[PDB]
Amino acid sequence: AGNATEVPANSTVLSFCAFAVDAAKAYKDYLASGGQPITNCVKMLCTHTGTGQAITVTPEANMDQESFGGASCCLYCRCHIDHPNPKGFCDLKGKYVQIPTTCANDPVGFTLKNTVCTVCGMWKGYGCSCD
Amino acid sequence: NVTGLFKDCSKVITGLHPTQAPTHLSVDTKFKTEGLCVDIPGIPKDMTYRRLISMMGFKMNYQVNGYPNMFITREEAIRHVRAWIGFDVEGCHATREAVGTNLPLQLGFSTGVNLVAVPTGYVDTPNNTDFSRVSAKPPPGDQFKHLIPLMYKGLPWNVVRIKIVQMLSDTLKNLSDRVVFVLWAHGFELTSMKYFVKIGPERTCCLCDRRATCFSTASDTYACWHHSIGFDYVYNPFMIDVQQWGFTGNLQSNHDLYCQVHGNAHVASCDAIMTRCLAVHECFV
Ligand SMILES: COc1ccccc1C(N)=O
Ligand SMILES: [Mg+2]
Ligand SMILES: [Zn+2]
Ligand SMILES: [Zn+2]
Ligand SMILES: [Zn+2]
Ligand SMILES: [Zn+2]
Incomplete structure (x- = not known):
């Protein structure tokens, strides 16, 4: 009974991160040790005529980005572990995340390492025009 | 190819x-096209779901610099025979709002200890994963009729894991700087370990130079077996699956070839005693 959600390629990385005290550090260390990035993400078929904002209610990928469903880009959602904010809720789940195409091979790692500018809504270092 | 790890055990049709x-x-299949997914404006999100996610199918075979391996070789286990603690879990089946996974019910150790837990599971919601009590029923067999009263004699997991850390500390403080769980068909025991085990790099105790075997969520601190009072997590444990050593039949039949003093009372601690006993006989004779 039941319906699978995962593929064998993710078993090792998700098992390792699901048991860690610091899951974020465990994933970064996993990637640094040559481990393959988490796959099976929700990549969207979109027009690529979007605003380019990082986290949105609809896919907003531009020509230099890829749109993904937010829960599939969140390490905590993928591992079914506690979210690190005090309220215990997710900031990606329920939204769409725009990842630069050059980083689309690892959308979970991209959202773990990067921050969104709270003024322009673009990723810091990848679209945020202001200083 | 798909895996059973994180299998959605809900009865929701979509x-x-x-x-x-x-x-x-x-x-949902409605959104799939060309190997990708599409957003369909007008089809809304579900804001009230509670989906049980299966913790059956963990694979602890990672190779990460600075992180020790959980599953050790037979030769490394022999060197640490003082750290051996047999471990077995009898479980119950998810029911009513979910079906397709087992939940820890009786946790047995080779120390004679049996700890009963409230059927608890990992439930995906629109905001997070809620670690909470779920509906459950004992396995339908007559060899599992002793589990029916246990469905109401369970303790919440925050209490259960404190007892495990406490029992392991009392037993191992003057024997070892580690714990080696001796298992037989490790799958479900490894699932149970998700409820009381934390892993990471090798750390030292906060009150001494001994390696850390415990972790505290309340203080974000690490401790050895001597200074673990109030600690809730077993930190960086080791383990081995005796079943994978070429044995043909079930645990009891292989145990009974070398030993006649550990009868089967059918409880989790008896299987844990038999597992450690078999490991000692196979390894040192
Ligand atoms: C400390 O080892 C023990 C001592 C007495 C009874 C059982 C055990 C054990 N670990 O299985
Ligand atoms: Mg058993
Ligand atoms: Zn999340
Ligand atoms: Zn900005
Ligand atoms: Zn200490
Ligand atoms: Zn025996």
Whole structure:
């Protein structure tokens, strides 16, 4: 009974991160040790005529980005572990995340390492025009 | 190819909305096209779901610099025979709002200890994963009729894991700087370990130079077996699956070839005693 959600390629990385005290550090260390990035993400078929904002209610990928469903880009959602904010809720789940195409091979790692500018809504270092 | 790890055990007929689905596989079929997914304005998110996620199928075979391996070789286990603690879990089946996974019910150790837990599970919601009590029923067998009263004699997991850390500390403080769980068909025991084990790099105790065997969520601190009072997590444990050593039949039949003093009372601690006993006989004779 039941319906699978995962593929064998993710078993090792998700098992390792699901048991860690610091899951974020465990994933970064996993990637640094040559481990393959988490796959099976929700990549969207979109027009690529979007605003380019990082986290949105609809896919907003531009020509230099890829749109993904937010829960599939969140390490905590993928591992079914506690979210690190005090309220215990997710900031990606329920939204769409725009990842630069050059980083689309690892959308979970991209959202773990990067921050969104709270003024322009673009990723810091990848679209945020202001200083 | 798919795995049973994180299998959705809910009875909801539809898949998830692209923004709520953890994976492409779990996205509802309505949204799938050309190997990708599409957003369909007008089809809303589900804001009230409670989906039980299966913790059966963990694979602890990672190779990460600075992180020790959980599963050790037979020769490394022999060197640490003082750290051996047999471990077995009898479980119950998820029921009513979910079906397809087992939940820890009786946790037995080679120390004679049996700890009963409230049937608890990992439930995906629109905001997070809620670690909470779930409906459950004992396995339908007559050899599992002793589990029916246990469905109401369980303790919440925050209490259960404190007892495990306490029992392991009392038993191992003057014997070892580690714990080696001796298992037989480790799958479900490894699932149970998700409820009381934390892993990471090798750390030292906060009150001494001994390596850390415990972790505290309340203080974000690490401790050895001597200074673990109030600690809730077993930190960096080791383990081995005796069943994988070429044995043909079940645990009891292989145990009974070398030993006649550990009868089967059918409880989790008896299987844990038999597992450690078999490991000692096979390894040192
Ligand atoms: C400390 O080892 C023990 C001592 C007495 C009874 C059982 C055990 C054990 N670990 O299985
Ligand atoms: Mg058993
Ligand atoms: Zn999340
Ligand atoms: Zn900005
Ligand atoms: Zn200490
Ligand atoms: Zn015996």
